[PDB]
Design an enzyme around this catalytic site. Structure first.
Site, PDB file in Angstrom:
ATOM      1  N   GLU B  46       0.831  -1.196   0.000  1.00  0.00           N
ATOM      2  CA  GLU B  46       0.000   0.000   0.000  1.00  0.00           C
ATOM      3  C   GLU B  46       0.869   1.251   0.000  1.00  0.00           C
ATOM      4  OE1 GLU B  46      -1.486   0.726   3.824  1.00  0.00           O
ATOM      5  OE2 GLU B  46      -2.995   2.207   3.236  1.00  0.00           O
ATOM      6  N   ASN B 108      -6.878   6.634  -1.182  1.00  0.00           N
ATOM      7  CA  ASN B 108      -5.878   5.578  -1.072  1.00  0.00           C
ATOM      8  C   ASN B 108      -6.288   4.481  -2.049  1.00  0.00           C
ATOM      9  OD1 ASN B 108      -4.025   3.572  -0.289  1.00  0.00           O
ATOM     10  ND2 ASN B 108      -4.057   4.261   1.848  1.00  0.00           N
ATOM     11  N   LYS B 125      -9.620   2.835  -0.952  1.00  0.00           N
ATOM     12  CA  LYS B 125      -9.713   2.343   0.417  1.00  0.00           C
ATOM     13  C   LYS B 125     -11.023   2.771   1.068  1.00  0.00           C
ATOM     14  CE  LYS B 125      -6.615   1.704   4.361  1.00  0.00           C
ATOM     15  NZ  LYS B 125      -5.365   2.180   5.014  1.00  0.00           N
ATOM     16  N   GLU B 144      -4.505   9.013   8.642  1.00  0.00           N
ATOM     17  CA  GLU B 144      -5.045   8.646   7.336  1.00  0.00           C
ATOM     18  C   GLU B 144      -6.385   9.323   7.082  1.00  0.00           C
ATOM     19  OE1 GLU B 144      -5.102   5.066   5.355  1.00  0.00           O
ATOM     20  OE2 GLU B 144      -3.345   4.155   6.306  1.00  0.00           O
ATOM     21  N   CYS B 170      -4.734  -2.634   3.293  1.00  0.00           N
ATOM     22  CA  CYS B 170      -4.301  -2.513   4.683  1.00  0.00           C
ATOM     23  C   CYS B 170      -5.339  -3.008   5.685  1.00  0.00           C
ATOM     24  CB  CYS B 170      -3.929  -1.061   4.992  1.00  0.00           C
ATOM     25  SG  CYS B 170      -2.857  -0.870   6.435  1.00  0.00           S
ATOM     26  N   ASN B 195       0.389  -1.149   5.257  1.00  0.00           N
ATOM     27  CA  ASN B 195       1.402  -0.440   6.037  1.00  0.00           C
ATOM     28  C   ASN B 195       0.887  -0.368   7.470  1.00  0.00           C
ATOM     29  OD1 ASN B 195       3.585   0.814   4.073  1.00  0.00           O
ATOM     30  ND2 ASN B 195       1.594   1.039   3.069  1.00  0.00           N
TER      31      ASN B 195
END
Lengths: 303, 301
Positions: B46, B108, B125, B144, B170, B195
């Site tokens: 990622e 993401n 994401k 994030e 993730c 990550n």
């Protein structure tokens, strides 16, 4: 020690068709008394712990009510209830339920939760029925659960009991992520699961791996305690899986059975340990996005 | 037959000082090693084109220097040209900066490319981790939610590499809904780059990293490839343990380092059919009338 429960996984051995029901109950009371000697406040019994695993035999759709239970409790199960209430121990008992509802006779794979005071607090009826509905001659072993039981009408419920949130599941329910998540959305802190998992003659390391993988994952991904109690041993030539386990909200195994007979595993489960991941990692109210999960309730197969 | 040799391209630490030219050259090096080992698909972690910049505090207008203008761009074009050359498809995670419905949006994002070089799919994401505001009590920050918004693609499954391929990013891998939603689309291969920082136990974090993937693979009868960007990244250690999981939940390949490492496994997609016929036959056993809380609620009740 306020919200710390001492649970006793009472794994059972094989129950043959020759065994009388009094011999079955006395083995349950014996396991019950072993839990009191070790200070257990809750003892979990397996699925259909009052008879042989009869779904492996063929008969009429009505022709096996002899293994079902008249009442709960009845004349044969009353000594178990009177013993548990005497020692102040609650228990979850799995049995085949024969009940009269709206005229017709209905049959359920049922687990009943009893409080330390001897009062029935909750009742769950099996949802995911395994096996096949009719006889298949090419298979070495049969599995006619869908022939003798119908889908339960209780759903995955969570009750206020033993100072916390307790839910129940039965056998192959533990293989579905929806079983844990539905009760996890009710702030569950302890899931009681009794199971009868057959083993094909001649791997076994993979079957035991899948048994614990589903429970260790459902416990962690919902931050709840999971107690899995089995009825193991060779039952009239049919070997049943053992490996009764008690899993922490971290997914770790804190207790594990070592035999395939009447064995009791105990562990002191702090219900406040279910709060770590609910606080941050698995905070359902924060991170969860139900607008993308619509396929789970919309369809049944694949698209 | 339906056998794909997958190469899990785990990366090492990528600091803010690292130039994007040096970053892509590390990706091409992992690509070439996969071709020499016969890999037909390469899975990248990622945000594989920048440092894990949710680690630092800034306004939401900033951090765009780590995002990507297009896909591919001038810096990512060499990776696409080398992949199509050797006939290898790949899945790459990156921060996406795109102009959609007027305003600019930040996602993401992971993109799936076929062996012919064509972009097959794009996943954004959904489950954003971390916090939105600065927290001085934390040893390390994780913002994030500050730099990314929730993706608007959902969990998709495409027809690629002779099978059904889905993607997740993730911390999607810790939710059972991530595997099940794609499992209801007959998915056979889930690609997940992650990550995950490591707070100084470590054995339990790696246990939870594999437990969620081994369960999602078995309980949906699908392959799961988990690749990581590990190592100490500007004083912040990232988790390794890149794995390739069979539909039985077994780990068939596992990384041994916290740097640029490639794990390889021959994945027979027909092995998914073993359990989808009976054990996990969704059409036969699933009772959606009892799962209504999964879509009706967000928290607990």
């Amino acid at each position: 020690m306020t919200r710390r429960i001492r649970i006793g996984g009472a794994q059972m051995g094989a129950i043959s068709r020759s065994d009388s029901k009094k011999e079955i109950v006395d083995r349950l009371i014996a396991l019950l008394r072993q839990a009191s000697e070790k200070g257990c406040e809750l003892v979990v019994f397996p699925e259909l712990a009052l008879s042989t695993f009869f779904p492996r035999w063929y008969a009429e759709r009505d022709g096996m009510d002899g293994y079902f239970e008249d009442g709960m409790p009845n004349a044969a199960t009353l000594p178990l209830f009177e013993e548990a209430r005497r020692l102040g121990i609650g228990f979850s008992l799995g049995y085949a339920e024969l009940v009269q509802e709206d005229g017709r006779v209905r049959r359920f794979n049922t687990t009943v939760l009893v409080e330390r005071n001897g009062e029935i607090v909750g009742k769950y009826r099996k949802i995911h029925l395994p096996g096949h509905a009719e006889y298949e001659p090419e298979r070495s072993h049969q599995h006619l659960e869908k022939r003798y039981f119908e889908v339960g009408n209780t759903g995955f419920q969570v009750w206020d009991a033993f100072g916390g949130r307790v839910g129940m599941a039965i056998c192959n329910d533990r293989r579905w992520v929806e079983t844990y998540r539905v009760m996890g959305l009710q702030n569950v802190e302890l899931i009681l699961i009794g199971y009868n998992t057959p083993v094909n003659d001649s791997s076994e390391t993979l079957g035991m791996f899948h048994n614990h993988l589903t429970m260790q994952a459902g416990a962690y991904q919902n931050s709840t305690w999971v107690v899995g109690v089995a009825k193991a041993g060779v039952e009239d030539g049919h070997r049943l899986m053992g490996g009764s386990v008690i899993v922490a909200p971290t997914g770790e195994i804190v207790a594990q059975a070592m035999t395939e007979g009447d064995e009791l595993i105990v562990a002191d489960c702090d219900l406040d340990r279910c709060r770590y991941y609910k606080s941050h990692i698995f905070n359902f109210a924060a991170h969860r996005r139900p607008e993308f999960y619509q396929r789970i309730t919309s369809q049944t197969g694949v698209e």
